[PDB]
């Protein structure tokens, strides 16, 4: 809750000035962070899912919700009901502490990190990014793992416009460009 | 949203008591207050009512939206109902969980003398 | 030859053809060929009368066809007895009531439209007439 403490005193004072909001409730705020691993190759065996869910449980310290197919499609050879991915929703204090560890540790540990995109805000403020490799988090031991996974991070916020979420992450020095 | 989904969650048992002809006690729960009223089987008029918005009940309480306040409402609405001669009702939970402040009201109303 | 691409059903009852029509006013173009009689126009009769008016204007102007043959018509083959199922769909008609505008036309003078629709009406079984776009 270090950044949550950092949110409540200086980010709110910053955004109220540069947007001239009438109320303090009118400010944006982050709401949840969703950690998906679409593991489409787990239809061969459960153990790839069972270890990828084990890896994402180490990144964010929650047991992941194993997601399933909403319907059946034949291009991917899946039926409605097959376990096909895993997610973690992060809210409250656990949202901020992962968000602290993300932009301070794991984003510098990206190989050939050169910035993010400012064109990834889904028209309505909600930001989504995808990492290539789970080794950028220091939770994963390099010798103990064998397979390079990938996950994607989705920050869902209360910003109405598209730029207001872009200004919100910039108050947390989110490395756009 | 939350207000609308609560009504859909409540509107099955309300229609079931509507055809049973049951004089029915309605609890309503807010984060600050809790409400109770006994409604006639035509559904258009009430018989007795009690709340933590009334001065005579809230001043005897610490906070209006805890279980002790919720037990004080269910005790008060039952003593007003038995004064008017209403004894057998049917508890309408009104889309809340039968739990906590809702349960503490109904346990108070059973104990104070209402029959459901 | 006009024909529906898909149909919900392959065959249809014979029905009746009583009542007045609905496509009465000249909607799109300026001059119109209005049906006065009653009957059915086949897909051959519609397409033959279109050719007879397209050549009379030397493809000048624009021709609408207000009707469309969507009713399937069955026939039994020769030397087949009256039982044993409904006959095979042979051709397509459009049921025409009195008052139906059959064709429309503009981009041509009035006298050219009279002589074009007269050449077209000689290919149609029903009695027709000439109409113009009425204000209101």
């Amino acid at each position: 809750a270090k950044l949550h403490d950092y949110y409540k005193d200086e980010v709110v004072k910053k955004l109220m000035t540069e947007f001239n909001y009438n109320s303090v409730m009118q400010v944006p705020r982050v709401e949840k962070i969703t950690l998906n691993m679409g593991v489409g190759e787990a239809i061969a065996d459960k153990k790839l899912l069972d270890n990828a869910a084990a890896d994402l449980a180490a990144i964010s310290g929650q047991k992941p919700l194993i997601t399933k197919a909403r319907k059946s499609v034949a291009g991917f050879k899946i039926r409605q009901g097959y376990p096909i991915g895993c997610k973690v929703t992060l809210r409250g204090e656990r949202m901020w502490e992962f968000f602290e560890r993300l932009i301070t540790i794991a984003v510098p540990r990206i190989r050939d990190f050169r910035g993010l995109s400012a064109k990834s805000f889904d028209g309505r403020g909600n930001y989504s990014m995808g990492v290539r490799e789970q080794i950028i988090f220091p939770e994963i031991d390099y010798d103990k793992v064998d397979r390079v996974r990938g996950l994607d991070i989705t920050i869902t916020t209360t910003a109405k416009s598209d730029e207001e979420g872009r200004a919100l992450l910039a108050a947390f020095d989110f490395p756009f460009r | 949203d939350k207000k609308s989904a609560r009504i859909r969650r409540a509107t099955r048992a309300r229609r079931k008591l509507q055809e049973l002809g049951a004089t029915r006690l309605v609890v309503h729960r807010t984060p600050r207050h809790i409400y109770a009223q006994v409604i006639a089987p035509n559904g258009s008029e009430v018989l007795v009512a009690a709340s933590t918005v009334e001065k005579a009940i809230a001043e005897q309480l610490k906070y209006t939206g805890n279980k002790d306040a919720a037990a004080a409402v269910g005790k008060a609405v039952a003593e007003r109902a038995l004064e008017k001669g209403i004894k057998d009702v049917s508890f309408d939970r009104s889309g809340f969980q039968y739990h906590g402040r809702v349960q503490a009201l109904a346990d108070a109303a059973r104990e104070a003398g209402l029959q459901f | 030859m006009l024909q529906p691409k898909r149909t919900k059903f392959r065959k249809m009852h014979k029905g009746r053809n009583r009542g007045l029509a609905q496509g009465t006013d000249v909607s799109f173009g300026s001059f119109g060929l209005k049906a006065v009689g009653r009957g059915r126009l086949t897909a051959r009769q519609i397409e033959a009368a279109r050719r007879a008016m397209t050549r009379a204007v030397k493809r000048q102007g624009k021709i609408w066809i207000r009707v469309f043959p969507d009713k399937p018509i069955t026939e039994k083959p020769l030397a087949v007895r009256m039982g044993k199922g409904k006959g095979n769909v042979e051709y397509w008609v459009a049921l025409i009531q009195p008052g139906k505008v059959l064709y429309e036309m503009d981009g041509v003078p009035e006298e050219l439209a009279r002589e074009a629709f007269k050449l077209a009406a000689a290919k149609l079984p029903i009695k027709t007439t000439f109409v113009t776009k009425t204000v209101m």
């Binding site: 180490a58 310290g61 929650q62 047991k63 932009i103 510098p108 050169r114 490395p175 | - | -």
Partner: protein
């Protein structure tokens, strides 16, 4: 949160080569030694240099004089 299903989530210390001592809550357990943090990553100085297009005329004039 539920009681048993979650992994152990304990506050540890992560230090870096620039000496940025930072205490975070984590699932590592043992202490952590980092390499680059967001304070010392060359995103704000180093990545600007790393484009390095270079001039073709400037390469030509450097190699001699007329």
């Amino acid at each position: 949160m539920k009681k048993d299903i979650h992994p152990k989530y304990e506050e540890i210390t992560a230090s870096c080569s620039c000496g940025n001592v930072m205490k975070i809550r984590s699932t590592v357990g043992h202490d952590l030694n980092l390499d680059v943090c967001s304070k010392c990553h060359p995103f704000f100085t180093g990545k600007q240099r790393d484009v390095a297009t270079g001039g073709r005329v400037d390469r030509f004039n450097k190699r001699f004089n007329i």
